[PDB]
Write a protein that binds this ligand. Structure first.
Ligand SMILES: O=c1nc[nH]c(=O)[nH]1
Ligand SMILES: O=c1nc[nH]c(=O)[nH]1
Ligand SMILES: [Zn+2]
Ligand SMILES: [Zn+2]
Lengths: 158, 158
């Protein structure tokens, strides 16, 4: 399901999540990749300037809306370190992007938060296909479960 | 309870939706109201230029994160002609806005779209509280339902 190439991109997402963490933001990174394997756009979380909606997948949906034809959007892939929240999953579906691949699920992150005693997000951790039934979704990647546990702990578990 | 003040704001939302319809956009309008009864920001749907995520409730959330302190956001009210889609409900809860009042439910709109044989949105019509469990939500308003049915019919009927 997750190819070797798919892993390479998820690892790039983990590196963008790390840049975010190192810069004071939350550890989420995301990459948009055309059908050919060329990276079109990369972004990471930027909520530290006060806007909690500054999620990378959202910015990818809007970048694609402005710069890609619908046909090209349907055949592009979004890679993300963490599974799209409902905001990001709906935006993705609204603009007509294609396959999503995630390293860790929002269910896992949900679970990990409570284990540390951290406050739950005000947004439910709904799987992507509850929000967006038509989207092709792959993940998680078992290889990245430990790394993402560590990253998420660095930010949310003290 | 939807009060008489609330209904006045919903009627302004219906007017903004009609402005969207006359401009060639989809009929959605929303208003952000301070706890003092002051209108702070007003917007409507702007998707015709090709960005399908140009929902007014989402513009409200970003304007609020930019312009209001967290505490002022929590005490302000968002009025909307149509119930927040999952993208907009999530954004609202991320930035920590308060009460939502809507004139017509996304369930009502979904049923109407099915009657017209209109193609269903790529985003599921989840109730606000499925996405954002902590938000106080009121509506629909029985008195504006037929009015919004007519505006929807103008855009989506066939
Ligand atoms: O930047 C983000 N991307 C997905 N979910 C979340 O809470 N934050
Ligand atoms: O502008 C919008 N607001 C709510 N739902 C929708 O499809 N569009
Ligand atoms: Zn998100
Ligand atoms: Zn919306």
């Amino acid at each position: 399901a997750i190819s070797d190439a798919d892993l390479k991109y998820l690892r790039r997402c983990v590196d963008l999540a790390r840049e975010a963490l190192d810069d004071g933001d939350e550890p989420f990174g995301s990459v948009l990749v055309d059908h050919t394997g060329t990276t079109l756009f990369e972004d990471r979380n930027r909520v530290k300037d006060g806007d909690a909606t500054a999620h990378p997948e959202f910015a990818i949906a809007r970048w694609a809306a402005r710069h890609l034809t619908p046909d090209r959007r349907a055949r592009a892939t979004v890679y993300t370190s963490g599974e799209h929240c409902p905001m990001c999953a709906a935006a993705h579906a609204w603009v007509g992007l294609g396959r999503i691949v995630y390293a860790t699920s929002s269910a896992q992150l949900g679970g990990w938060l409570t284990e540390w005693g951290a406050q739950a997000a005000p947004v439910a951790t709904l799987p992507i296909n509850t929000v967006a039934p038509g989207v092709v979704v792959d993940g998680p990647a078992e290889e990245l479960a430990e790394t993402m546990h560590n990253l998420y702990r660095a930010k949310f578990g003290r």
